[PDB]
Amino acid sequence: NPTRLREASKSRVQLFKDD
Amino acid sequence: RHLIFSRFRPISVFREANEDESGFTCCAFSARERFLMLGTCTGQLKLYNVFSGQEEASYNCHNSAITHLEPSRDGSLLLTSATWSQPLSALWGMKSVFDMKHSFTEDHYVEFSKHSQDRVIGTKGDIAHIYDIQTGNKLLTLFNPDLANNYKRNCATFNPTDDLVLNDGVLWDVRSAQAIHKFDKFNMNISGVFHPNGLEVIINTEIWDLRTFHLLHTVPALDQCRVVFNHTGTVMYGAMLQSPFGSSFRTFNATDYKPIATIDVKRNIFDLCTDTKDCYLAVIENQGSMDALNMDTVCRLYEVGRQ
Amino acid sequence: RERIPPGNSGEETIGEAFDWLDRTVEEINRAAVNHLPRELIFQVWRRSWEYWHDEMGMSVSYTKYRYLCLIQKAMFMHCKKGCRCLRPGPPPPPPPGL
Ligand SMILES: [Zn+2]
Numbered sequence: 001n002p003t004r005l006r007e008a009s010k011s012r013v014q015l016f017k018d019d
Numbered sequence: 020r021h022l023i024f025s026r027f028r029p030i031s032v033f034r035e036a037n038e039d040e041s042g043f044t045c046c047a048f049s050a051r052e053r054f055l056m057l058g059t060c061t062g063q064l065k066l067y068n069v070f071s072g073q074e075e076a077s078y079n080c081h082n083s084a085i086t087h088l089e090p091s092r093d094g095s096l097l098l099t100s101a102t103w104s105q106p107l108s109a110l111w112g113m114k115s116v117f118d119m120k121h122s123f124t125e126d127h128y129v130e131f132s133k134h135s136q137d138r139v140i141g142t143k144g145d146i147a148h149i150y151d152i153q154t155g156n157k158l159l160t161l162f163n164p165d166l167a168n169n170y171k172r173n174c175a176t177f178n179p180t181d182d183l184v185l186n187d188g189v190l191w192d193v194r195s196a197q198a199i200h201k202f203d204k205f206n207m208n209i210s211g212v213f214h215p216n217g218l219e220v221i222i223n224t225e226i227w228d229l230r231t232f233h234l235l236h237t238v239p240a241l242d243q244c245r246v247v248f249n250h251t252g253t254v255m256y257g258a259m260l261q262s263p264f265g266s267s268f269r270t271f272n273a274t275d276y277k278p279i280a281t282i283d284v285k286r287n288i289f290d291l292c293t294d295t296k297d298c299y300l301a302v303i304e305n306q307g308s309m310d311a312l313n314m315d316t317v318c319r320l321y322e323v324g325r326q
Numbered sequence: 327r328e329r330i331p332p333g334n335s336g337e338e339t340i341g342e343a344f345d346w347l348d349r350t351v352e353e354i355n356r357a358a359v360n361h362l363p364r365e366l367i368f369q370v371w372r373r374s375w376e377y378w379h380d381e382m383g384m385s386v387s388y389t390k391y392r393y394l395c396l397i398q399k400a401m402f403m404h405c406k407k408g409c410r411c412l413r414p415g416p417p418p419p420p421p422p423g424l
Pocket of ligand 1: 360361404409410411
C-alpha cells in the first residue's frame with residue numbers, strides 16, 4: 001500500500017490502533 | 020550563585036502528542052533555543068516550540084532508543100546516537116531538508132570537535148575514531164591495549180582547543196597520535212571529561228591537573244553521576260546512575276567544586292540539559308516499571324533561580 | 327526566528343509502516359536475548375498480550391507496538407549502565423513547499 005501516512009492523516013500509533 | 024542555582028520551579032510538561040504512553044529518552048536545545056529537541060524510545064526525534072508547546076516536526080532517524088543529541092553551533096548539523104540498531108550513530112543536515120549525511124555504523128557515542136567543528140570524534144568500545152565532516156573519511160584511530168582501562172561507559176572526547184583527546188582514561192596527543200599519560204583507575208564505569216576552563220580533567224570523583232597531573236580535589240558527591248556544564252563553565256549539574264536511575268540531581272560550583280543544592284524530583288531521571296542563558300533546565304522524567312506494563316516518560320521544563 | 331526542515335515521519339507509506347513493525351519486533355527479540363534474561367522477555371511478551379490483546383481487545387499491531395516500546399526502554403536502561411555482554415533507511419523529505 002503506497003498511501004503516505006500524511007495523506008491518511010495518521011501517525012504510526014493511530015494506524016496500528018485502527019484495523 | 021549558591022542562591023540562584025539552588026532554586027528551581029516547574030513551568031511546563033511535554034508529552035508525545037499522538038501516543039498513549041510518552042516515550043522520551045533524550046533532550047537538547049536547538050542552536051537558537053526556539054525549540055526543544057526530544058529523542059524517543061523507537062528512534063524518532065520530535066521538535067517542540069518552547070514558547071507555544073506545539074510539536075512542529077517529527078523525523079525518523081534510527082531503529083532504537085536515542086541516547087545522545089548534539090546540534091552544531093551554527094544549527095546546520097546534528098549528531099545522534101542510538102542503542103542497539105546499526106547504524107548506532109549518524110550525522111544529519113538541518114537546512115531546507117532533513118537528510119542523512121554520514122553513518123558511523125559501529126560507534127555508540129559521537130561528538131563534534133570543540134574549537135572549529137570540522138571533525139567528529141566517535142567511540143567504539145575502547146577505541147576512538149576521528150572523522151572529517153566533509154568526506155566522512157576516517158582520519159585516525161586511537162587505541163593502545165597496554166594502556167586501556169576498559170571503563171564500561173567509555174566516551175572519547177576532545178579538549179577545548181582540539182589538541183588533546185581523552186579516551187578510556189588515556190590522554191592522547193592528536194598531532195603525533197602518541198599517548199601522553201594514563202590516569203589512575205578508581206572506578207569501573209566513568210571515563211572522564213575536560214573542564215571548559217582547559218586546565219582540569221574530571222574523572223568520576225577525582226579532579227586532576229591537566230599540566231602537572233596532580234590530584235587537586237576529591238568530590239565524593241559526584242560518584243557515578245552523569246555530568247553536564249552550563250554555557251559559561253561556572254556550574255555543573257549531575258544526575259546519579261547506579262532501574263538504577265536516581266530521582267535527584269545535584270548542582271556544583273564549577274570553580275571551587277563546592278556543592279550548592281540537591282533537588283528531588285520524585286521521578287527517575289534519564290537525561291537533562293541547559294540553555295545558554297541559564298534560564299531553563301529540561302529534564303527527562305520517567306515513572307512506572309516493566310512489571311506494571313507502564314513506563315510513561317515525559318519532559319519537564321524548569322525556571323532556574325525562582326522557587 | 328529559527329527555522330527547521332519539515333518532518334519526514336509522515337512520508338513513510340502505510341505498507342512500509344506495517345513491515346517496519348513486524349521486522350523490528352523480531353529483530354529486537356533476537357538482540358535482547360544477548361543482554362537481558364530470556365525469561366524477562368518471555369514474561370513481558372505474554373503479559374502484554376494478555377492485557378492488550380485478550381483483555382482490552384486491541385489489534386495484534388497495536389499490541390505488538392506497546393510491547394516494542396517497553397523492550398526499547400529496557401534496552402535503553404541496559405546500555406546506559408554500560409554493556410560488556412558476550413535496513414531500508416529513512417523515508418524521503420516531503421516535496422519542498424508542500
Ligand atoms: Zn549487554
